[PDB]
mmCIF file of all heavy atoms in Angstrom:
data_model
loop_
_atom_site.group_PDB
_atom_site.id
_atom_site.type_symbol
_atom_site.label_atom_id
_atom_site.label_comp_id
_atom_site.label_asym_id
_atom_site.label_seq_id
_atom_site.Cartn_x
_atom_site.Cartn_y
_atom_site.Cartn_z
ATOM 1 N N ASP A 29 207.232 63.308 56.712
ATOM 2 C CA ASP A 29 205.861 62.938 57.041
ATOM 3 C C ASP A 29 205.556 63.213 58.519
ATOM 4 O O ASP A 29 204.670 64.007 58.849
ATOM 5 C CB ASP A 29 205.667 61.460 56.708
ATOM 6 C CG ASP A 29 204.237 60.973 56.895
ATOM 7 O OD1 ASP A 29 203.288 61.785 57.046
ATOM 8 O OD2 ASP A 29 204.081 59.733 56.913
ATOM 9 N N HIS A 30 206.313 62.570 59.406
ATOM 10 C CA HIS A 30 206.087 62.695 60.837
ATOM 11 C C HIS A 30 207.182 63.564 61.433
ATOM 12 O O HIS A 30 208.380 63.434 61.075
ATOM 13 C CB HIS A 30 206.051 61.317 61.510
ATOM 14 C CG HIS A 30 204.859 60.502 61.145
ATOM 15 N ND1 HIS A 30 204.669 59.209 61.593
ATOM 16 C CD2 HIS A 30 203.788 60.787 60.362
ATOM 17 C CE1 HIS A 30 203.545 58.733 61.090
ATOM 18 N NE2 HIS A 30 202.986 59.678 60.357
ATOM 19 N N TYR A 31 206.750 64.454 62.319
ATOM 20 C CA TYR A 31 207.612 65.481 62.906
ATOM 21 C C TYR A 31 207.433 65.584 64.415
ATOM 22 O O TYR A 31 206.419 65.152 64.988
ATOM 23 C CB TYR A 31 207.321 66.844 62.283
ATOM 24 C CG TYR A 31 207.562 66.945 60.791
ATOM 25 C CD1 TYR A 31 206.606 66.508 59.881
ATOM 26 C CD2 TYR A 31 208.740 67.494 60.290
ATOM 27 C CE1 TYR A 31 206.815 66.613 58.519
ATOM 28 C CE2 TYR A 31 208.957 67.610 58.913
ATOM 29 C CZ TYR A 31 207.992 67.164 58.045
ATOM 30 O OH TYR A 31 208.197 67.250 56.695
ATOM 31 N N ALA A 32 208.441 66.141 65.068
ATOM 32 C CA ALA A 32 208.303 66.564 66.435
ATOM 33 C C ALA A 32 208.636 68.046 66.523
ATOM 34 O O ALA A 32 209.555 68.532 65.850
ATOM 35 C CB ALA A 32 209.185 65.761 67.310
ATOM 36 N N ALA A 33 207.884 68.774 67.347
ATOM 37 C CA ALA A 33 208.087 70.211 67.478
ATOM 38 C C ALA A 33 208.148 70.615 68.943
ATOM 39 O O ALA A 33 207.302 70.186 69.738
ATOM 40 C CB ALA A 33 206.988 70.942 66.787
ATOM 41 N N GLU A 34 209.155 71.416 69.289
ATOM 42 C CA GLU A 34 209.153 72.158 70.542
ATOM 43 C C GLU A 34 208.747 73.613 70.261
ATOM 44 O O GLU A 34 209.317 74.264 69.371
ATOM 45 C CB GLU A 34 210.513 72.103 71.236
ATOM 46 C CG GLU A 34 210.493 72.907 72.510
ATOM 47 C CD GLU A 34 211.762 72.832 73.305
ATOM 48 O OE1 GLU A 34 212.756 72.261 72.788
ATOM 49 O OE2 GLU A 34 211.740 73.332 74.455
ATOM 50 N N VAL A 35 207.739 74.114 70.984
ATOM 51 C CA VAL A 35 207.258 75.493 70.804
ATOM 52 C C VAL A 35 207.257 76.175 72.153
ATOM 53 O O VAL A 35 206.643 75.674 73.092
ATOM 54 C CB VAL A 35 205.828 75.556 70.220
ATOM 55 C CG1 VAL A 35 205.438 77.001 69.934
ATOM 56 C CG2 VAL A 35 205.721 74.693 68.957
ATOM 57 N N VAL A 36 207.958 77.294 72.250
ATOM 58 C CA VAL A 36 208.025 78.051 73.479
ATOM 59 C C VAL A 36 207.395 79.414 73.209
ATOM 60 O O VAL A 36 207.782 80.124 72.270
ATOM 61 C CB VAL A 36 209.474 78.189 73.970
ATOM 62 C CG1 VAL A 36 209.559 78.954 75.288
ATOM 63 C CG2 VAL A 36 210.096 76.810 74.108
ATOM 64 N N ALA A 37 206.418 79.776 74.024
ATOM 65 C CA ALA A 37 205.680 81.015 73.793
ATOM 66 C C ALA A 37 205.119 81.574 75.093
ATOM 67 O O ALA A 37 204.605 80.820 75.924
ATOM 68 C CB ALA A 37 204.558 80.773 72.802
ATOM 69 N N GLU A 38 205.210 82.899 75.253
ATOM 70 C CA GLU A 38 204.711 83.555 76.439
ATOM 71 C C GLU A 38 203.207 83.339 76.555
ATOM 72 O O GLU A 38 202.711 83.170 77.658
ATOM 73 C CB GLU A 38 205.057 85.066 76.421
ATOM 74 C CG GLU A 38 204.650 85.825 77.697
ATOM 75 C CD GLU A 38 205.310 85.258 78.928
ATOM 76 O OE1 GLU A 38 206.522 84.904 78.822
ATOM 77 O OE2 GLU A 38 204.620 85.151 79.990
ATOM 78 N N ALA A 39 202.488 83.320 75.431
ATOM 79 C CA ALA A 39 201.049 83.049 75.440
ATOM 80 C C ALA A 39 200.664 81.694 76.080
ATOM 81 O O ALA A 39 199.512 81.500 76.492
ATOM 82 C CB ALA A 39 200.508 83.113 74.055
ATOM 83 N N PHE A 40 201.616 80.773 76.181
ATOM 84 C CA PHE A 40 201.372 79.496 76.842
ATOM 85 C C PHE A 40 201.399 79.542 78.385
ATOM 86 O O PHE A 40 200.945 78.589 79.047
ATOM 87 C CB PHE A 40 202.415 78.485 76.410
ATOM 88 C CG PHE A 40 202.346 78.063 74.954
ATOM 89 C CD1 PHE A 40 203.399 77.358 74.414
ATOM 90 C CD2 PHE A 40 201.257 78.339 74.153
ATOM 91 C CE1 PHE A 40 203.385 76.924 73.103
ATOM 92 C CE2 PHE A 40 201.225 77.896 72.836
ATOM 93 C CZ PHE A 40 202.306 77.200 72.312
ATOM 94 N N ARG A 41 201.935 80.612 78.978
ATOM 95 C CA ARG A 41 202.110 80.632 80.449
ATOM 96 C C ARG A 41 200.751 80.640 81.154
ATOM 97 O O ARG A 41 199.858 81.409 80.796
ATOM 98 C CB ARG A 41 202.946 81.828 80.918
ATOM 99 C CG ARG A 41 203.578 81.600 82.303
ATOM 100 C CD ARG A 41 204.436 82.800 82.773
ATOM 101 N NE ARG A 41 205.451 83.188 81.806
ATOM 102 C CZ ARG A 41 206.662 82.644 81.723
ATOM 103 N NH1 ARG A 41 207.014 81.644 82.527
ATOM 104 N NH2 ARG A 41 207.528 83.086 80.818
ATOM 105 N N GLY A 42 200.584 79.746 82.124
ATOM 106 C CA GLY A 42 199.293 79.554 82.783
ATOM 107 C C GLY A 42 198.299 78.621 82.085
ATOM 108 O O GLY A 42 197.258 78.291 82.664
ATOM 109 N N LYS A 43 198.606 78.198 80.856
ATOM 110 C CA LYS A 43 197.754 77.268 80.126
ATOM 111 C C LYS A 43 198.235 75.851 80.367
ATOM 112 O O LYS A 43 199.409 75.632 80.664
ATOM 113 C CB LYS A 43 197.752 77.599 78.633
ATOM 114 C CG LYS A 43 197.080 78.929 78.324
ATOM 115 C CD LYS A 43 196.864 79.119 76.843
ATOM 116 C CE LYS A 43 196.189 80.473 76.555
ATOM 117 N NZ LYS A 43 196.865 81.609 77.297
ATOM 118 N N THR A 44 197.307 74.901 80.292
ATOM 119 C CA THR A 44 197.623 73.493 80.418
ATOM 120 C C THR A 44 198.321 73.043 79.141
ATOM 121 O O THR A 44 198.175 73.706 78.098
ATOM 122 C CB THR A 44 196.347 72.638 80.590
ATOM 123 O OG1 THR A 44 195.583 72.699 79.374
ATOM 124 C CG2 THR A 44 195.470 73.129 81.777
ATOM 125 N N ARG A 45 198.986 71.894 79.183
ATOM 126 C CA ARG A 45 199.553 71.331 77.965
ATOM 127 C C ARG A 45 198.471 71.085 76.915
ATOM 128 O O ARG A 45 198.710 71.344 75.747
ATOM 129 C CB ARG A 45 200.347 70.035 78.223
ATOM 130 C CG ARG A 45 199.645 68.969 78.961
ATOM 131 C CD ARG A 45 200.628 67.783 79.273
ATOM 132 N NE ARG A 45 201.203 67.214 78.054
ATOM 133 C CZ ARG A 45 202.506 67.117 77.759
ATOM 134 N NH1 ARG A 45 203.451 67.555 78.594
ATOM 135 N NH2 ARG A 45 202.866 66.550 76.606
ATOM 136 N N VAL A 46 197.273 70.638 77.307
ATOM 137 C CA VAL A 46 196.205 70.449 76.320
ATOM 138 C C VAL A 46 195.836 71.796 75.651
ATOM 139 O O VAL A 46 195.653 71.871 74.420
ATOM 140 C CB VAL A 46 194.976 69.793 76.988
ATOM 141 C CG1 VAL A 46 193.724 69.854 76.089
ATOM 142 C CG2 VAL A 46 195.321 68.352 77.333
ATOM 143 N N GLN A 47 195.732 72.847 76.459
ATOM 144 C CA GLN A 47 195.438 74.185 75.948
ATOM 145 C C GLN A 47 196.546 74.710 75.020
ATOM 146 O O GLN A 47 196.267 75.343 73.987
ATOM 147 C CB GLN A 47 195.217 75.143 77.114
ATOM 148 C CG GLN A 47 193.880 74.925 77.805
ATOM 149 C CD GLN A 47 193.740 75.753 79.078
ATOM 150 O OE1 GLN A 47 194.731 76.070 79.742
ATOM 151 N NE2 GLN A 47 192.506 76.109 79.417
ATOM 152 N N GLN A 48 197.796 74.418 75.355
ATOM 153 C CA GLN A 48 198.909 74.883 74.539
ATOM 154 C C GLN A 48 198.913 74.164 73.204
ATOM 155 O O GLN A 48 199.085 74.784 72.135
ATOM 156 C CB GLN A 48 200.214 74.666 75.289
ATOM 157 C CG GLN A 48 200.319 75.510 76.564
ATOM 158 C CD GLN A 48 201.389 75.006 77.517
ATOM 159 O OE1 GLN A 48 201.959 73.930 77.317
ATOM 160 N NE2 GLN A 48 201.693 75.802 78.553
ATOM 161 N N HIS A 49 198.682 72.855 73.252
ATOM 162 C CA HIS A 49 198.666 72.075 72.028
ATOM 163 C C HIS A 49 197.538 72.535 71.124
ATOM 164 O O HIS A 49 197.699 72.584 69.906
ATOM 165 C CB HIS A 49 198.561 70.583 72.335
ATOM 166 C CG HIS A 49 199.773 70.057 73.035
ATOM 167 N ND1 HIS A 49 200.030 68.710 73.192
ATOM 168 C CD2 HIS A 49 200.808 70.708 73.612
ATOM 169 C CE1 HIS A 49 201.163 68.557 73.855
ATOM 170 N NE2 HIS A 49 201.658 69.756 74.124
ATOM 171 N N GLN A 50 196.414 72.913 71.716
ATOM 172 C CA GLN A 50 195.294 73.400 70.919
ATOM 173 C C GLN A 50 195.712 74.605 70.115
ATOM 174 O O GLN A 50 195.328 74.740 68.939
ATOM 175 C CB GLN A 50 194.097 73.741 71.811
ATOM 176 C CG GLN A 50 192.858 74.194 71.044
ATOM 177 C CD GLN A 50 192.301 73.079 70.160
ATOM 178 O OE1 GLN A 50 191.937 71.999 70.657
ATOM 179 N NE2 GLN A 50 192.270 73.318 68.839
ATOM 180 N N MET A 51 196.478 75.502 70.740
ATOM 181 C CA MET A 51 196.921 76.730 70.054
ATOM 182 C C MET A 51 197.833 76.369 68.878
ATOM 183 O O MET A 51 197.790 77.024 67.835
ATOM 184 C CB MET A 51 197.647 77.694 71.009
ATOM 185 C CG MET A 51 196.780 78.240 72.141
ATOM 186 S SD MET A 51 197.683 79.302 73.305
ATOM 187 C CE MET A 51 198.053 80.666 72.239
ATOM 188 N N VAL A 52 198.653 75.328 69.039
ATOM 189 C CA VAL A 52 199.528 74.878 67.953
ATOM 190 C C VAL A 52 198.701 74.244 66.831
ATOM 191 O O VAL A 52 198.911 74.560 65.644
ATOM 192 C CB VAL A 52 200.595 73.886 68.450
ATOM 193 C CG1 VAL A 52 201.525 73.416 67.310
ATOM 194 C CG2 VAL A 52 201.440 74.562 69.487
ATOM 195 N N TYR A 53 197.751 73.374 67.160
ATOM 196 C CA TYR A 53 196.893 72.819 66.106
ATOM 197 C C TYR A 53 196.177 73.930 65.338
ATOM 198 O O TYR A 53 196.069 73.870 64.103
ATOM 199 C CB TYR A 53 195.848 71.852 66.676
ATOM 200 C CG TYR A 53 196.461 70.650 67.383
ATOM 201 C CD1 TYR A 53 196.015 70.264 68.643
ATOM 202 C CD2 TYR A 53 197.481 69.898 66.790
ATOM 203 C CE1 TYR A 53 196.551 69.201 69.299
ATOM 204 C CE2 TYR A 53 198.035 68.803 67.452
ATOM 205 C CZ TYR A 53 197.549 68.458 68.711
ATOM 206 O OH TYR A 53 198.042 67.386 69.429
ATOM 207 N N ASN A 54 195.664 74.916 66.068
ATOM 208 C CA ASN A 54 195.022 76.093 65.459
ATOM 209 C C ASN A 54 195.935 76.772 64.463
ATOM 210 O O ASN A 54 195.496 77.173 63.372
ATOM 211 C CB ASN A 54 194.601 77.122 66.496
ATOM 212 C CG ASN A 54 193.420 76.691 67.308
ATOM 213 O OD1 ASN A 54 192.766 75.669 67.017
ATOM 214 N ND2 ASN A 54 193.126 77.464 68.350
ATOM 215 N N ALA A 55 197.202 76.893 64.833
ATOM 216 C CA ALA A 55 198.162 77.617 64.014
ATOM 217 C C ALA A 55 198.385 76.902 62.682
ATOM 218 O O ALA A 55 198.600 77.543 61.643
ATOM 219 C CB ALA A 55 199.498 77.806 64.786
ATOM 220 N N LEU A 56 198.272 75.580 62.691
ATOM 221 C CA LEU A 56 198.519 74.807 61.485
ATOM 222 C C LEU A 56 197.328 74.853 60.528
ATOM 223 O O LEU A 56 197.458 74.448 59.382
ATOM 224 C CB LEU A 56 198.873 73.365 61.828
ATOM 225 C CG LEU A 56 200.388 73.110 61.827
ATOM 226 C CD1 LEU A 56 200.972 73.264 60.413
ATOM 227 C CD2 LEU A 56 201.111 74.033 62.806
ATOM 228 N N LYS A 57 196.188 75.355 61.002
ATOM 229 C CA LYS A 57 195.051 75.717 60.141
ATOM 230 C C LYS A 57 194.579 74.566 59.253
ATOM 231 O O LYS A 57 194.027 74.771 58.147
ATOM 232 C CB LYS A 57 195.420 76.968 59.310
ATOM 233 C CG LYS A 57 195.534 78.240 60.180
ATOM 234 C CD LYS A 57 195.880 79.519 59.411
ATOM 235 C CE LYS A 57 196.091 80.694 60.373
ATOM 236 N NZ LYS A 57 194.886 81.119 61.138
#
């Protein structure tokens, strides 16, 4: 049910943690 995820991606460089998390939420569609 509940998970924790570490995601490392070059697309995250220069983005804030809020911006990075947004990209992950987007990915989960």
